[model samples]
Target: EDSTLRYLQDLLAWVEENQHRVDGAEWGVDLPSVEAQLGSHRGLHQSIEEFRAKIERARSDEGQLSPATRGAYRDCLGRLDLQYAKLLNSSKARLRSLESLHSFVAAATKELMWLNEKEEEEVGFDWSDRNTNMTAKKESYSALMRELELKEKKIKELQNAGDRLLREDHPARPTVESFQAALQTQWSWMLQLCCCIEAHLK
Candidate 1:
């Protein structure tokens, strides 16, 4: 009975989280589908709560049960146990699927952002015409260098933020570290490219 109660509590929490996620329209979620899923769980949650309350009331009556009544109680508990197990497994699978979807979306967004930044840089590189004067080329190189410097400054700021967050024992430290690492890697490549261009210009 205790285990069943705990399972119901966990299920309630999971449902509440998913409901909020759905209502917020996060991760391209379908509202009607989420509502239908939530509707199914709502009935189950109420049933479980009522069943738990019934068991509690029976225990509080503090009377010795007849053999037949004891047998019926055992049968009811067994059915509840099976029902709880089935629902718990289903809830866990649903939660795992939701989390996996969120992770995939997050990773795809990060990759898309990187691709867009690279495209911007490619466009920036086209600012100088093929027949442009040496002065124009020099200016272009100076502009690119300034952009690289700004990027480097931003990376440094991110690293400092990550460090501060880590010191505070924030749960986001891992994500912050990953962000800083990706930026640092991009910064290194950009710096090397800038140096190569500078050497050629000289």
Candidate 2:
């Protein structure tokens, strides 16, 4: 196989290998939850595979297909392959970035826990003020958690929206720009939660 096909195979394999981790993530909308929101893709992947096979068949017989048919087959294969590459690359990048951001937030939470557990005297605060600060911190954490939950819900909704498009027999897939925008909105909210949590640590 060519390098492109090899990359595609590896990409699919990696996704499957880590599928359960994604399904079990602490993120409110885990992979399985999102999967439930997803609908059938109406043979989108199969179409791409079939297109690839046709391209191979056309090339195998030393261009036996008529000139016009050969040209059409090549064009279809190119367009379908391009779409497949774009969809795979964009989705994987977005998912990986989100996972990285979540890891950072989880690390920050660990640090915050460590700070909270240390003796108040070490932070040089009066006992009364320290108690008040602790209470406020708890409230802030609660608020931030709620914000994260809301953002996750929005993401789930957006995912379902995309899935609905995929489910249609001949759906007009949303533009990459549209999908990226939806993904960005979710990350923006997540970043806001990260900022809130970090500030509360202060």
Candidate 3:
């Protein structure tokens, strides 16, 4: 029973972390499989509740049992409680990872869009026009580059965290890898675009 609980906890932790990956956003994403995993975890949670109630009842009737039996029950219940606590900790870790990943993705995407817009604006401006504020354009480009560098650094930090988790053979490794791939792809493209704009400014 303990081994089974451990296995279930690991599976649940993985599923919870990767739940967003099957959101119909990518090709070959299996939504039904994800849903099924969630359903199974819910059932396991219900079972844990039932087990806790049974343990409580046994504890209340401790007076009816022999000292030896009472001692054994207490020992077993303690271990069970510890396992449940570990499960909760695992759930919390997964939640934290998911939250961090979401925030990073959102910020990175927004920054990319902002830089793209700056590029478009620069393209529309006539550099030869005497009224063109070359100083402002240079400052704007520098600001955009600074912001991109900051976001890129944050992404690298987040990626390091995710990679550490992956090294532990986390169930969410694929999801983490996918996010890394997406970010790197965008980062490369944005970096190239920024460089092109910088060259044009010179």
Models 1 onward score TM values of 0.40, 0.31, 0.49
Best by lDDT: 3
For candidate 1, lDDT tens digit of each residue in 113-178?
Answer: 664585467446633346356676678788876766665565565567556656765433444455
- Model 2, poorest ten-residue lDDT window? 33-42
After superposition, which runs of candidate 1 have C-alpha atoms over 4 Å from their true positions?
A: 1-132
Query: What would the per-residue lDDT of candidate 3 be over residues 94-122, giving only the tens digit for each residue?
Result: 44444444444445455546556755776
* Backbone clash pairs in model 3 (N, Cα, C under 3 Å; residues 3+ apart or in different chains), count: 0
Number of the predicted model whose TM-score against the real structure is largest:
3
Report each candidate's C-alpha RMSD, comma-separated, in the order given.
10.3, 14.7, 9.0
Candidate 3 at 134: error in angstroms?
3.4
Clashing pairs in 1: none
Counting clashing residue pairs in each candidate, in order, gives: 0, 0, 0
Shift in Å, residue 107, candidate 2 = 0.9
Write the number of the candidate with greater TM-score, choosing between 1 and 3: 3
Error at 52, model 3, angstroms: 1.4
